[PDB]
Amino acid sequence: NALKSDFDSLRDQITKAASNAKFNGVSIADGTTTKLSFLANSDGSAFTVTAKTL
Amino acid sequence: TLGGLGLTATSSFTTAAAAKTMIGTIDTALQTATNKLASLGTSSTGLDTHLTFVG
């Protein structure tokens, strides 16, 4: 039961570390969004970057 | 004026796709503005040449 308690501790520490991964309110690893478009040219071409959920 | 460039006084954007459309809208507006300015400059050069001829 000591190891299972340490297991649950590291488990919800994963939840904390994943929830805190955001930059200026936007996150690519939190899982709040499917993808983030980005500028690629002056005409507005997208630079798609698929989100990877952690 | 904004109506001469295809724009409106209320023209704006509220969603990122609206900004993506506004990119090309401002492209068209800047292009037509440059064409009208070039035409006005050619008309001014014609007025100067006609002034010299009248003299």
Side-chain angles (χ1 to χ4, degrees), chain B:
Chain B
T1 74
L2 283 158
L5 315 160
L7 304 184
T8 61
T10 63
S11 197
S12 163
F13 63 91
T14 61
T15 306
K20 177 155 185 24
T21 301
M22 193 59 90
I23 295 168
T25 299
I26 301 299
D27 278 355
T28 294
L30 180 53
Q31 195 93 48
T32 187
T34 45
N35 309 134
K36 314 186 148 144
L37 285 162
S39 302
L40 287 183
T42 293
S43 281
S44 197
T45 286
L47 292 167
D48 215 334
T49 300
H50 196 65
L51 185 64
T52 295
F53 183 64
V54 175

